[PDB]
């Protein structure tokens, strides 16, 4: 029960799952063929949440993959764990996005979505009891920006009660992947706050330095950067899938983390992080995990929690650890960092304790942050937005694909109406 349908979108949104589904299947002992090889009977206790049990004692990931070109979908099946997916779920267009939100939401998105919304519906009745949908995409490109959000508005009409969370990729502050990424951000951020219950923002630029300053990786490729994305997503649902002393799910991490229904942009963190030449000198204790999280260089977003206050904090723990070693540390980080939290929410620390550690470690954790430091993350987008839009830069491509200025003007001020909320709750009493 409580099954989750996994949906992907974009070139970034596909290769994450090739890393993501490699990690989840190795938490239950699954070959790339699709059979079972585990030793303990606990691994099949909640196996049905990411697996529809097929015939022949095989297992398939309840996953739907969406692109606008075949340049990625053939690359997934020709790698490791590309054999696990069902060949019917690869729904994709033929031409390509062209890195355009207008083509990603109006031109090709109107055609391909009917070949997806039946497949989601085909996985809807496959679920014995549906929990919610998770989405993996980006915000700078074309496919991950528009075609992701075009699914979200149709799903929320079909499922108002079901939860929704998107592991999006917020673009970096200084270096630029996409030239038109301020237009692709604001026109998609206007859609995220309409029909998503929570969002976990991940920056590329922070994940470069986490792999370099902490892991000391000489050549960090995407087979290692996307591994930290998978360690976050597996660290959230790890209480839904295993017995623990204090359970948690995607609903407990949604009610206790969102005070107001538009203030739901989060920041993830992971702990511990050991280098291959710096692991044999560390004391693996629970208070070592706590002080590693709350600094700047362990956040997975370009954010400064020193210039900001937290509102809600969720920590999900894995492994056979005690409670007084956890609960006393959660109190002490509120006392010494008393200016770093908010005043009108008393004791804003959420505790989640599981009993299955990650394979390869003994104890671990997963950090979920919610602070008003993301107001710099959106105003810097909004500063680049108002500079380009007043020059009508790159505007005729969107205008040529059926789009008016009032689409921009409402979406511009709605971000300004978003940040003005955060600054209002930042320094009140």
């Amino acid at each position: 029960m409580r099954e989750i349908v996994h949906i992907q979108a974009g070139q970034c949104g596909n290769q994450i799952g090739a890393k993501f589904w490699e990690v989840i299947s190795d938490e239950h002992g699954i070959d790339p063929t699709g059979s079972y090889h585990g030793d303990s009977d606990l691994q099949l206790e909640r196996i049905n949440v990411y697996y529809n049990e097929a015939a022949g004692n095989k297992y398939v990931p309840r996953a739907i993959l969406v692109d606008l070109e075949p340049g990625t979908m053939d690359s997934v099946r020709s790698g490791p764990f590309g054999q696990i997916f069902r060949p019917d779920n690869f729904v994709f267009g033929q031409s390509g996005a062209g890195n355009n939100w207008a083509k990603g939401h109006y031109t090709e998105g109107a055609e391909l979505v009917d070949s997806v919304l039946d497949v989601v519906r085909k996985e809807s009745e496959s679920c014995d009891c549906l929990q919610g949908f998770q989405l993996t995409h980006s915000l700078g490109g074309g496919t991950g920006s528009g075609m992701g959000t075009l699914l979200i508005s149709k799903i929320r009409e079909e499922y108002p009660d079901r939860i929704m969370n998107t592991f999006s990729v917020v673009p970096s502050p200084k270096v630029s992947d996409t030239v038109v990424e301020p237009y692709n951000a604001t026109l998609s951020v206007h859609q995220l706050v309409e029909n998503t219950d929570e969002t976990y923002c991940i920056d590329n630029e922070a994940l470069y330095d986490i792999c370099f300053r902490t892991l000391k990786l000489t050549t960090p490729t995407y087979g290692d950067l996307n591994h930290l994305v998978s360690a976050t997503m597996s660290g959230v649902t790890t209480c839904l899938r295993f017995p623990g002393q204090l359970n948690a799910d995607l609903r407990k991490l949604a009610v206790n983390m969102v005070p107001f229904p538009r203030l739901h942009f989060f920041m993830p963190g992971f702990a511990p992080l050991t280098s291959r030449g710096s692991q044999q000198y560390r004391a693996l204790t629970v208070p070592e995990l706590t002080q590693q999280m709350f600094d700047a260089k362990n956040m997975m977003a370009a954010c400064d929690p020193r210039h900001g206050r937290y509102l809600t904090v969720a920590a999900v723990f894995r492994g056979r650890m005690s409670m007084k070693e956890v609960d006393e540390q959660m109190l002490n980080v509120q006392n010494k960092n008393s200016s770093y939290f908010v005043e009108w929410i008393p004791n804003n620390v959420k505790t989640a304790v599981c009993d299955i550690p990650p394979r390869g470690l003994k104890m671990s954790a997963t950090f979920i942050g919610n602070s008003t430091a993301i107001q710099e993350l959106f105003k810097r987008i909004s500063e680049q937005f108002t500079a380009m839009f007043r020059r009508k830069a790159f505007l005729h491509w969107y205008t040529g694909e059926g789009m008016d200025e009032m689409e921009f003007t409402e979406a511009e001020s709605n971000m300004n109406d978003l940040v003005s909320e955060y600054q209002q709750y930042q320094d009140a009493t």
């Binding site: 409580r2 929990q131 204090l246 005690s322 007084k324 005043e343 008393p346 004791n347």
Partner: protein
């Protein structure tokens, strides 16, 4: 021929109850498969063959913590018509505990409970074990407390409800689930016993010399209170006590039904030597504020009525000498209108220890119940948490958007303001 059935609501219902029913198995010779290779008619009905079953109704809205009983060591002990589960959990939401999900299976649990009463005649009361922080232990309890007063009514209900800690918080929505369940259970319940987490971590570090306990290790001490209140039913004692008597001996006013529990002695096995544990040594440890299981200092309040339960080697001349020294002190000060504030019970059999446990096999032990007035200071700070979180309208849309009128907070808060100053009325003395 007197029976008493138990209800376990939420995750705190399950993980307390498994350590509780483990202790009942080890006393009446019950194996983990029910056989015994009498006196246990109270909590264990008998089949046609020589196998017995517990009188348990385990219920939760999430299936994880139930299935550990369905596959664990106590697999073939419990009737599988009693492990009532559901699809989706309330997940810290009083609306999903009382208005959305709890509306479904509230008419399913009541079927099994009445079938337990059909094979009993001495049904004295109930045992409802839940928590205040979580939604399922608050919401699904609060709807259940209506239907029990509808159907049975006269049977003396009880609560070993987990009081929310004033400085150790797990969930953010504890100042909403604590307040909203208080407006409901005040109309129906009879006597709610409070056990708090924070004071147990104070005791188990200082008095058990264990600085790293778990919830399984905390539930071992909670089972000491459960076996020592229901001690006069199973075993016979020199001076017994009934479950109907607790709502008369400890409830002066019908709007105040909050006593608290205290257990003594709590010493480790290597420290079990070097002292004799005399009856006056183990009774001054009860009224000491450092040994209570609720972090509320009683010296800033008064005691309306106290209760003393004794089990082990107990001489009634020694208990009489133990009480009179306490009333001649000044750190304990009673309320002016109640000089006769003690209900003393004596049972012969000592508490036994679980193998692989933490406490030690002693000759005698005390479980003290007291109805203080200093707990209202914790109620003000709980309401002080509620004042800031509601005036900012925080987390409201998760409640109103799931079938809850927003004006219902105006009804619960004003009733809370009444009971906040009801301790002001009782706590002051009379005129001359």
């Amino acid at each position: 021929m007197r029976e008493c059935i138990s209800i376990h609501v939420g995750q705190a219902g399950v993980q307390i109850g498994n350590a509780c029913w483990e202790l009942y198995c080890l006393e009446h010779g019950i194996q983990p498969d029910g056989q015994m290779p009498d006196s246990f008619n109270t909590f264990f009905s008998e089949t046609g063959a020589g196998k017995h079953v517990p009188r348990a109704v385990f219920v939760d809205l999430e299936p994880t913590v139930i299935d550990e009983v369905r596959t664990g060591t106590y697999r073939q002990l419990f009737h599988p018509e009693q492990l009532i589960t559901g699809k989706e959990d309330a997940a810290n939401n009083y609306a999903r505990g009382h208005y959305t999900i709890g509306k479904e299976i509230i008419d399913l649990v009541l079927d099994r409970i009445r079938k337990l009463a059909d094979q009993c005649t001495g049904l004295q009361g109930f045992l409802v074990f839940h928590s205040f922080g979580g939604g399922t232990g608050s919401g699904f309890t609060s709807l259940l407390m209506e239907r029990l007063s509808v159907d049975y009514g006269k049977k003396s209900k009880l609560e070993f409800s987990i009081y929310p800690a004033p400085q150790v918080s797990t969930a953010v929505v504890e100042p909403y689930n604590s307040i909203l369940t208080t407006h409901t259970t005040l109309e129906h319940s009879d006597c709610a016993f409070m056990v708090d987490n924070e004071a147990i971590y104070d005791i188990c570090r200082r008095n058990l010399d264990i600085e790293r306990p778990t919830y399984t290790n905390l539930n071992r001490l909670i089972s000491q209170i459960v076996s020592s209140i229901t001690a006069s039913l199973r075993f016979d004692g020199a001076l017994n006590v009934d479950l109907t008597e607790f709502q008369t001996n400890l409830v002066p006013y019908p709007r105040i039904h909050f006593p608290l529990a205290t257990y003594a002695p709590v010493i480790s096995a290597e420290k079990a030597y070097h002292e004799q544990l005399s009856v006056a040594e183990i009774t001054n440890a009860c009224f000491e504020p450092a040994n209570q299981m609720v972090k509320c200092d009683p010296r800033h309040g008064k005691y309306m009525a106290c209760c003393l339960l004794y089990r082990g080697d107990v001489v009634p001349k020694d208990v009489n000498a133990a009480i009179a020294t306490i009333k001649t002190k000044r750190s304990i000060q009673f309320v002016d209108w109640c000089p006769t504030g003690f209900k003393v019970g004596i049972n012969y059999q000592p508490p036994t220890v679980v193998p692989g446990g933490d406490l030690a096999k002693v000759q005698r032990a005390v479980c003290m119940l007291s109805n203080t007035t200093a707990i209202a200071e914790a109620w003000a700070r709980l309401d002080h948490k509620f004042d800031l979180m509601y005036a900012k309208r925080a987390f409201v849309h998760w409640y109103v958007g799931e079938g809850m009128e927003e004006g219902e907070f105006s009804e619960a808060r004003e009733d809370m303001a009444a009971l906040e100053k009801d301790y002001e009325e009782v706590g002051v003395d009379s005129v001359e």
